[PDB]
């Protein structure tokens, strides 16, 4: 379709330069700092998690018809009695593990659904707490570098 070659090449450029700047440590945007802090906090969370339990990806027996209900249940119990930055990190890592488990077990359809369920939960039930507690900037100060 008209213009898609050109558009795809522009996305490769943007993606490669972004990978390369953040690789060398440079946070250029505001959300770039947040994303970088989130990726690293996710990595640390999972390192501790798997060091204490099994792999976070093995603890989940999920199907497309059943994935939603399972996701909403685990998340609702995770925040049932409070929110904090660490549990928010756990919430991202959980979603990440769901996606990895889905592609590995050949249910790639679930990936962009899980992203939507996460974004909806993040925007409806976590974003008020985040605003009351300094916004993503406070998170970057606590978990970046």
């Amino acid at each position: 379709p008209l213009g898609s070659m050109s558009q795809s090449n522009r996305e490769l450029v943007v993606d490669f330069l972004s990978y390369k700047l953040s690789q060398k440590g440079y946070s250029w945007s505001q959300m770039a700092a947040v994303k970088q802090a989130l990726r690293e906090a996710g990595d640390e969370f999972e390192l501790r998690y798997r060091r204490a339990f099994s792999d976070l990806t093995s603890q989940l027996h999920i199907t497309p018809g059943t994935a939603y209900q399972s996701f909403e249940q685990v998340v609702n119990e995770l925040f049932r009695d409070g929110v904090n930055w660490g549990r928010i990190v756990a919430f991202f890592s959980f979603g990440g593990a769901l996606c990895v488990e889905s592609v590995d077990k050949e249910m790639q359809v679930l990936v962009s659904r899980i992203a939507a369920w996460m974004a909806t939960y993040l925007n409806d039930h976590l974003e008020p707490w985040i605003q009351e507690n300094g916004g993503w900037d406070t998170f970057v100060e606590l978990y970046g570098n």
């Binding site: 969370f45 603890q59 685990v74 998340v75 660490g86 549990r87």
Partner: peptide, 21 residues
């Protein structure tokens, strides 16, 4: 239950994470 145990492991690992910051 099955997912109750999962969210408990997530909850306690996150809390440990939160304290250490």
């Amino acid at each position: 239950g099955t997912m109750e145990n999962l969210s408990r492991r997530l909850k306690v690992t996150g809390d440990l994470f939160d304290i250490m910051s």
